[PDB]
Symmetry: D2
Subunit: 425 residues, 4 copies
């Protein structure tokens, strides 16, 4: 039905292993990855990656989130970077095979007591320019997040706040920070200066583990491919670091100087893309799924209940994708937390949700712009078919495949409760 060739690809012999030791022993360099790369790539915009033509090459290479580092540059400089990103993104609104939403994230300069005056002004700039995410620098406690949230004013409550953990206090107060944040960034640069360099891997693994347990995005950042600022190829430690961040459970991986100022910004994005694809196939889903299941408390929320049912069904049939309809991205995030091998294709009418779901591993957003049908059930079927046809066009799906489809019982956010098994025709 699928063939022996299917079961030799994407580390499937290592996937069937009964122990983690046997899983390692069965990893094969000749077993090619087939699934689309699920860990998002955040690229820092700077002199080496500002031009519209360079940004088009970075989008093609795999960049999903453009980071603006507000530690340098004026508001005028960053507004031009935003306009260049949006111009490069919209240049592909013709071909549906190449069009992809790209999120814009603002990284603050940092704190002094309370939020700095420059951070208040930069956060206001972000709201005025429609940024999707804020990477808040030096978050140490829950009140630091509340201050950033308050500065996002009356108009920016939909912006995701990713708290950067950069010091001992942030690590110690991690649980209270994660509870009030949308996600976390393991900011290894400052963290490696604030705590002993030999302890950073413990903080990284702990934070990734806790974010995976909470179902919240976690970004691994800084010096992942550092030598690529001046060299065309990374060191053996650098490729290992990227692979291990993905195996640890990071939703996003980041490039800073590699894309902002280095000589090989596009090559650095290509390298992160190539490593993440290899590492995602090497994940030991048998143990991961069982442990995510065992740790996750019982839930009476139908979205959470449908999500675990859909992920279980996708593993049972080797589903090419899980197509989910989402207004805020939440139904896609709840599927993503169980780490399915199947791609989560999120169909949405919200351009902001489409950009923000790049924070969740394995979510491939599709922005639906067709006008509503008069009959709601027909409008749902048209969006389900839109995900199927986009999936066929991009290579996720073929006729005869099985897909899991996740929808809700009435319009509006918060009513997901249906999982369907569909044969692609």
């Amino acid at each position: 039905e699928l063939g022996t060739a299917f079961f030799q690809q994407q580390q499937l012999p290592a996937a069937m292993a009964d122990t983690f030791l046997e899983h390692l022993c069965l990893l094969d360099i000749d077993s090619e990855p087939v699934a689309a790369r699920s860990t998002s790539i955040i690229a820092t915009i700077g002199p080496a990656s500002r031009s519209v033509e360079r940004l088009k090459e970075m989008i093609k290479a795999g960049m999903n989130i453009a980071r603006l580092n507000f530690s340098h540059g004026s508001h005028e400089y960053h507004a031009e970077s935003i306009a260049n990103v949006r111009e490069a993104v919209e240049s592909f609104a013709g071909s549906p095979l190449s069009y992809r939403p790209v999120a814009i994230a603002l990284d603050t300069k940092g704190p002094g007591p309370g939020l700095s005056e420059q951070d208040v002004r930069d956060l206001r700039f972000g709201v005025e320019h429609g940024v999707d995410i804020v990477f808040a620098s030096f978050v140490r406690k829950a009140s630091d997040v509340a201050a950033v949230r308050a500065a996002l004013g009356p108009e920016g409550h939909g912006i995701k706040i990713i708290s950067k953990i950069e010091n001992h206090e942030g690590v110690k107060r991690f649980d209270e920070i994660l509870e009030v944040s949308d996600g976390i960034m393991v900011a290894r640069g400052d963290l490696g200066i604030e705590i002993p360099a030999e302890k950073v891997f413990l903080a990284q693994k702990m934070m990734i583990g806790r974010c995976n347990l909470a179902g919240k995005p976690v970004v691994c950042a800084t010096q992942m491919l550092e030598s690529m600022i001046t060299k065309p190829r990374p060191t053996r430690a650098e490729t290992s670091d990227v692979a291990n961040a993905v195996l640890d459970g990071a939703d996003c991986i980041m490039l800073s100087g590699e894309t902002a100022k280095g000589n090989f910004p596009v090559e650095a994005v290509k390298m992160q893309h190539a490593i993440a694809r290899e590492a995602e196939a090497a994940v030991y889903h048998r143990q991961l799924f069982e442990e995510l299941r065992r740790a996750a408390p019982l839930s009476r929320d139908p979205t959470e209940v449908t999500a675990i049912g859909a992920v279980e069904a996708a593993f049972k049939c080797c589903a090419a994708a899980i197509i989910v309809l989402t207004t805020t991205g939440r139904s896609a995030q709840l599927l993503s937390r169980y780490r399915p091998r199947a791609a989560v294709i999120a169909v949405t009418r919200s351009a902001q949700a489409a950009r923000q779901v790049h924070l969740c591993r394995g979510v491939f957003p599709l922005l639906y712009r067709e006008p509503p049908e008069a009959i709601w059930a027909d409008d749902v079927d048209r969006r389900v078919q839109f995900g199927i046809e986009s999936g066929k066009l991009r290579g996720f799906l073929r006729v005869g495949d099985l897909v899991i489809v996740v929808t809700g019982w009435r319009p509006g956010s918060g009513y997901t409760n249906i999982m369907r098994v569909l044969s692609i025709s």
Copy 2:
């Protein structure tokens, strides 16, 4: 509430090891779930009175067994008529009506090598009288099952054949017999004479294990409550034997002389009911579900994929029930094979399928009698509402419970593909 988590051996259910699970079993933890292992009662002089049969149905009898080793065809036709008269006396309340299957147990081949002439005549009697199940005596190989199937003719294509394993050859050729049978009966009486008495428990445990792995019904039979033929209370070994047959994984438990000729037929049914309810709560679902999922192969059949998704969703939310619409009983059987703690309420229009699904542990059949609605989606919803209303009346459901609803995308058998999370209102 805290009271909820003290009942149905929930502290023992949360245990991390089987040893800790045994340590946490509590005699004060009352069973809450409806009894899921079916009771087969043999009909005889002690249980043919229509008024006595009504008491046995109320006590929990699900399948009435006619032992063709004793009595004439005229005697068995009167047994069938009395069973049907007692069963149909409750049809005036469709929300509480309990279907009861009729099983024909053959005399056997005797000194012959294959199907005897008396068995050919008895099987034809069964088809003419509309029996639901055949317990075929002394099945030794796959060709014995084919001969029973041939003797049932074209009119008896829907009858379930449960092969009785009663000797060494049947145990050795078990795999080939199970492959062509609808299920198995561990016929301990003859088996204990054909093989050493001290080895029967090994054959019982092996056969139950293999049937659970195949997703096919398995019946534990003979001398389970033997002393209740003359005494009002069973021995300590007898109550333990019933509990252990349920813990082993038997779908059905049987009564022979206890109901056919003894002085306490109703009390024997009540005792099996009481023990099975206690033993089902003591099942270690944490290990059982993991092992059934791991052993079950990948499937591209949407009914099988929806079944595992629905069972996973039911465990996630502590669903009171899985309501499934079924024509042949197949969708209910595929849910049952994963051993959910949630009751599988099977709503069907087929009176025969309603009787036959008693062979699957945890399937509670409801016979829907209303003619089809003009709009198919309304007819589906009416059947689901009938399941909810029957469930509320019988104590399976309460307002505020979560229920998993399993349906298909079009009319007719074979199209189950939808799982939905529903709150009981």
Copy 3:
């Protein structure tokens, strides 16, 4: 298959087909059940002890010799019936039958004598008849007391006090027979040497459909504590009048062994029935089949995970010896013991290997029958001048007795467990020896 390939080439495919070894290698309990085979013959010596109640059907010396040969390890005297004179005669007949085999020290079978008390009756604590019967037990040298209707820790303290300073070595097995005993189980087990799941009264005191829960819970907790647990009452009841038991009875015996019972008991089946010897033979045959069907892979992992870390060298040596025995498919673990404690600590990890306990104490040799898998050998030789040579002689006695008894063959590996100095409490050494 790579984890057993070399040992399969060495020991042969026939070795790995016996004693439910394909079911033993299974990765899940479901696959373990699927691989159980009625043609896979048991090889190991029966490890669950059989307690037989002595009565009119089993009191003669000649009948007792047949019961010892059939497998009886513990003789139970039910003090609910019979006078002190009647029970003293039963004790003398048991000792005469047991000593008739003492001529060959290498094959002699010690048999424990257990006194089962009448109980408190309508009273709240220790009755006057129990005080008199317990003093009779001390005066007649009984090894074990099965204390009836234990409801709390003070009930066992009262039994201990009635035994006096002379009965300090007697094992107290508390009988759990009612709701209060089940609810106060933890405090009772803490002060008892073991437990008896007394299903007869328990099945009257609590709903009959709940007894299996109390049995499984108590066996689980005793296995966790490493203390003996006895499953009792109506196991082979129909064998009082019939030569073959019912299908529920053979299942009940097998399930008590699979649950983890150290001992199984016969009451009326041996005390008053028409087939006392056949009932013992049936329990022996079922226990051997059920012991091979135990899923050691999960059981050993769970016993290890649940057992707290220990700084007691006897406990540390015990787990190391059991681990080593599983690694090499050791035929036996030979242990030197004074009180039986080192053998009990090996037994709590449920090795597949027989635990051959070499002791000079006749009482400890009788009492270790309470621990599953312990085969006592009574050493009658006087001590050597050099302690190290005396220890080596005792180990060689175990090997030679094991060879003559069929436990050990040339080429087998055995694990030997000893201590660093004389006296109880100093076990700390494990050795791997090849049988030549």
Copy 4:
């Protein structure tokens, strides 16, 4: 306080996910660093005074890269290493043996090259302990290296370097005839796509752990430390992940051979390895190693499993083992005990070679002999205890597992004893 140190809350976790969640930057490592450090000797690390600092920093194996330098150059490096090592021999209870490994140039465009034959002969003549054989592609390459060592070099350990696709594909046949493996990531990263090297590393480490044979992770682990005093975030993560993967040894090449911070690079590897060893999830690792190790009738194999099990049961500070060839210590090491394996040996070569096995701390026995063999054994065990107390491995009141044999000579280990310290 005991249960807050060495990641013990994370060690008690019921799942790997919970284990990650409980990792604590404030939980200080207490156990001695188990993963050996191999430092390449070059212009930056050739002086006797420099080598003494590197030994104090944690260097266990000195690597001589025969791709560069003459035989005269390498003989001087060997003499300087031995002079620095022997400067600490005055205190036998604290003396640290250091192995000398010869890394061959390789076959180049060719089987065994003529320069490799000459270099291997040099190694035997100069008493090297280990050979890192370059570009091993099949079992016959190992046989050729073994033949070139001759009858005088029967005791030298051959660690096969896997550097290309053929070596990865023929891994099982190479490991079967080798003493261990080196994941030579430099050439491997050029021979196969750079994004696939982590898969080859994890597979090879897993298979060596399964076989109970040493595995070395090598190349660019702390590359930026050649010119900078601190490594990058990717470099510290790489070292930690090689240890978490299961590497017995970690290596420094240019960082020690030609870089500006050779001592600091050794100190950095030491600090990271200690932190990573405490973060190992022993609960799962021991169960998996135990399950996968085949049944055995070899008493040394049987005693080793029993001793490791007993060490975990009592939180033993150490397993003290008497060994002639190092084999009894290697069989204990394969089960990855948390307890240090203190190997007491009279063989100076075995003391150097057991650095290839994670968690084996060699002690070279040089005390006068005892006339009674039982007394001589007891004295070697007391020597293990005293050196352990002096070095901080043991304290009074600790439990240790002692692994001895029933008669003199190698191959007779069969005894495990539980001993209370002082």
